[PDB]
Design a binder for this molecule. Sequence first.
Ligand code: AGS
Lengths: 40, 319, 268, 123, 681
Amino acid sequence: QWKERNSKQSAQELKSLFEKKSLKEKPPISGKQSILSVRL
Amino acid sequence: VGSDPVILATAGYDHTVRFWQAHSGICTRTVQHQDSQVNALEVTPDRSMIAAAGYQHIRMYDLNSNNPNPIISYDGVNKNIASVGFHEDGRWMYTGGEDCTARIWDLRSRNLQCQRIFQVNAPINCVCLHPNQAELIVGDQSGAIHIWDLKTDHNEQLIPEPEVSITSAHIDPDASYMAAVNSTGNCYVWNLTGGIGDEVTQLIPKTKIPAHTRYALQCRFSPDSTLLATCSADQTCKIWRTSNFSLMTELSIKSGNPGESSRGWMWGCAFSGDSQYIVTASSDNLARLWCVETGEIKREYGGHQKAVVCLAFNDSVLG
Amino acid sequence: INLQKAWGAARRVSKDDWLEWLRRLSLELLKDSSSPSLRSCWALAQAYNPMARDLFNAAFVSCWSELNEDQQDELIRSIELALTSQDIAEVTQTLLNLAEFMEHSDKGPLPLRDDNGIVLLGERAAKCRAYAKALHYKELEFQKGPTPAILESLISINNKLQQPEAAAGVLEYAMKHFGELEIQATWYEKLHEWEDALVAYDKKMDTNKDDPELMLGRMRCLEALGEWGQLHQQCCEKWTLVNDETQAKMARMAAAAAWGLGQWDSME
Amino acid sequence: EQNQGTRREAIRVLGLLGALDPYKHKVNISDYSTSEMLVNMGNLPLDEFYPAVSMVALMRIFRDQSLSHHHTMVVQAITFIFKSLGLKCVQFLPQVMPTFLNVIRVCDGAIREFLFQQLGMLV
Amino acid sequence: RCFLKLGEWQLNLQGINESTIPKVLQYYSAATEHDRSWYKAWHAWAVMNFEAVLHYKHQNQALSKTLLMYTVPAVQGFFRSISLSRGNNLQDTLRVLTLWFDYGHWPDVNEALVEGVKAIQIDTWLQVIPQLIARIDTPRPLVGRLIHQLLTDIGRYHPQALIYPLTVASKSTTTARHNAANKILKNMCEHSNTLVQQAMMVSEELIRVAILWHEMWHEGLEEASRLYFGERNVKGMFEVLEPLHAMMERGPQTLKETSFNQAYGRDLMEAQEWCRKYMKSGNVKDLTQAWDLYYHVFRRISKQLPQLTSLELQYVSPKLLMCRDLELAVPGTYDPNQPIIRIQSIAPSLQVITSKQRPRKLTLMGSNGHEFVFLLKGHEDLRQDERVMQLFGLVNTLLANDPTSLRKNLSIQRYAVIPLSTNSGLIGWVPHCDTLHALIRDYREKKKILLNIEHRIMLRMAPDYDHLTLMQKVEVFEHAVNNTAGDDLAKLLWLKSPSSEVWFDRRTNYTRSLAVMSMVGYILGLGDRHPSNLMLDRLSGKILHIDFGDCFEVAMTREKFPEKIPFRLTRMLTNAMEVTGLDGNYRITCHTVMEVLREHKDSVMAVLEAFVYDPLLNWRLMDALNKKAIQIINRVRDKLTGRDFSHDDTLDVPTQVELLIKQATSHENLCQCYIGWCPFW
Ligand SMILES: Nc1ncnc2c1ncn2[C@@H]1O[C@H](COP(=O)(O)OP(=O)(O)OP(O)(O)=S)[C@@H](O)[C@H]1O
């Protein structure tokens, strides 16, 4: 079910509890499309 | 079963969720979804289960085992759930509901309470997570675009054109642009955050793509960030390029005879890891698989007995 | 079957001949109708003609319901000839009323040359001064495929039916559904939209000077609008280097303009 | 009228009064069943449609006192219809009988002794 | 003339402020002194004074000296201008009533009021009889005494115009209202005693035929069960079903009531005994048996309601069929400029219409030999239909005083509405009309077409239709309207026409009577316009609207299925009005009606303000207390000023009408309407 009144007072804790700001995978690489070519 | 690098499934009005594989177009497992229609479904990033959202409930179906029933079901909202999605690591699920709310859920059976609610005075039509899993874009039935960052508790509001309801929005995985479409075909493209440092979330409208005389139902980028596919109510799906935003390729299911009278819309689309073969879900009681270059269809799956309004296509990271 | 000598005689010439043909037709139609009521009323209809006129549709349908294919086809050819042969009001009104009574039944309208002759019946009712029937048939013709001629005839018919709003709606439909500027200035003239007709004639003449009836329409718009100055100025510079079949039509406008300006020397 | 002088005088008086607009004219200023029947708006089948229109056509003649010369043939035709129909000739009574009695009342001469007789046949 | 023009122009240039009010006032006073026999000048002066009072009241609500200074000459000028018209002074009368009710208790306004009441004639009050009686129980001495004197004078001069609402207000539950009505009635029996007694008898007698005893008990139990089992409010169900026991212990007076007392009388006594035992010593064990008995009686009553299809007067009300003559006038038909029609007889048999409320079909017989057919309505409050009929009459007189609207014969068709109580009334019966649903139904049952073909196509393309999103429902609706040629109304209206001239005239009347009613219903806020609330006149083609229960956009802001359309304009109504579309007679008639309504926004605004501000009628609009009604009238003030779609601009008549057209004929709005509204027809 659904219940309200969750994490409504901790600001500094919510600043890093779930907002990890995960930013990676900047370098893109090429491929050969294994599954696509296997299906075809 | 889902023990395969690539999987794909469709859902519609025939009260079934069809799974198959692009080998011969034959169905593997047909999951029973009843008493409601499926608005949208999404696979979990760990590739263990699927989640289909429709009319006040989100039902999860195991992919590893052979189970036709909704092992995990979520309740509590009062209207439809337009779109769902999970964190890149499977930590929190963001659900935009029809009534007024875009909320988050906690996927752990513990008192974690990382769930929040974003409330607007208009019915939500689409939610889109940021590629950095920090921001989240909301598009409602009033042409307003609410870029809401999970870091803070304030959200900016942007209206390209009022009195017209936007239908979808998406951000390329490389975070190069941010596109959205409304109920008249217009496709505005604002430049997304360029300040990766402290999430400035600056927006400047680059261009507008005038197409899709009829309603535009969904627009999606490509994992390679070199293509952008948008589907319209005129039985067309147009794929555009990211260099000059011109018409790269156009596909259509029109038979060319006045005797059908719009026999089916193109509801959803998705790309592949190679950005070469796309899958489209039409309302012709079947789904199609096309190539972004040769134009003609490559495959067709016709196991459904009603319309098809949503589909999921996941493949390996290699591509 | 015994009426083909009354239908297909092919000898009617004058209006009285058509009247007597209609009388003999109704009489021989009421005499043998396979219905005791009409057959009994025939004896009185022989002495009173308006009664034979009032009982025409019932006798016609009762006799038509029993005819064969070739007999009714000859009947249709004869009634088509009777429609397109004369110009008087009595028999035309009778045939139009018969066609309406037949199209109000369950078996459908009696087949004319092509698609129940909505093009023939419409043009035959327009000259009979029965404009409601003409409008109904023009709407039936419009329901199949709309063309600019149908829209212009709808305007012309709704004008003489004292319905300017319907004509304005026809113009709006022609404007928001065609999109090539095919609306001729005469359409604006009929709607008494004199400014629009004037600017349309200006846009049609400024590209190239054309034959007559393109300056006479502009003169008509200038006259009905109330501008005597420009009217007389445009008439004076073209009164000399013009032919005879145009001065006869522009002379009254020239006289009205000279009267409005007070130039009695040119008005005379 | 056909005399041109009188027509000229009429249009002169018309112009002297002067161009009254049509609305002021229209301000200064049952019978529906016969139109329903002459066109068969009730969609009566052709079997039982001829009697009703024959009755209304005969009543159109039998109603006025000016055309009182063919009344004998009118009542003969009405009696023939009532006799040929059978038991279904009752629906025509409310429109036929009042005019019949009124004609019997207002007419005169050796036709009255006839009408009564025919009236008996109706009964 | 120049002074009036100068004042109006300064008003239009600089609005209403604290510096322009005295200048416009001196201009209008100069005009009045210059003419002294001009209705326009006095009317403008009085309206400026009233607007000054309104502005100075609204300013100090976000002294009682300036307000008086501006409201005394307001009343003076209004009473002066009432006597100048003598043919149409409804707005002035409503304004003097507003000032009377708001500041009539002040010792200075009361002098001008009592002067004006005797100054003007007595007929100018016959149009404001309802708005007066709605304030008869006022808690102030001066205004109350003046209202009582005015009502006594009206009853002395015109007794027939005031007897029905007086006997309606006499049989009320409020102490002050009913005792004041009884006082005025007993003061009325001095000069006319037989009329008052006959009216009391008739009113109390056909209010018993409207809702019989078993229907009363069915409704009461159906309400009390819901109350008790949904809100746990015993003190609510008690006051709901105590009046029933009270009216049941005074003895049955007819044969129907005696039969009901023989059949269900025993259980309803033991149930009351158990309820009393519970209310003495609180214990649900005593209420359970009472509810057992109540539910048994309810289940036995509910099975015999579908069988009720006719009523005899010897069985239901033996006093109505023994009149054979009366002094009362036939309800709904009384004008002081015509000979009155008296009630001679009443037919001894009524036919009950099979519906959810079962309205009877009463038919009186007047003194002139003509039958007056009515509709005796129960379980319904007919006090809103009366106000909307007054508004429609005002709009008819407005459209008649216009040159372009008079030559086109634009008018709204009204019917009589005579309320008898708070939950009963008598509606006039319009002949030759037939329901729009009861026309398509016949045309489809004759052409062998199934009735719900569109709904069946929708449920076949998608089984859970009413649960889809907006775009999916839009697609289903479009597929259902594209795969079906909807032209049943046009062919149905042509098939029933004798010739082409009659058909053309009927179509013209139908179009130009649909357009005016669309615009008027948009200005008013009419909702729930399903095919069962629209009737066609089979002889003239005009359109008749009924069921004026959902006004002021109540249906737009409700919770379940809120409608997003100003008026009803569907594909069946559009394919039967012309061959080109709704750009001909429809759009031009809409422009005409809208510009006429905008030129005379003051009269309709005064009528609607007198309607909404009524404290005993504004309970349906609130489903502080005076804060909602405000935000209603403001809304209307936008509809009549072109500021309803956006407040940063002011739209003219063409733009507003085209926006309304695009809103009413939009697939995204029609796809959301309830399936019973028939958005595909
Ligand atoms: N004023 C009227 N004049 C002629 N017929 C009327 C009139 N009012 C109602 N009717 C007819 O009586 C029928 C049934 O009356 P209604 O009171 O509308 O029934 P109802 O369904 O109980 O009403 P509601 O409030 O819409 S549920 C109407 O649908 C029309 O057929």
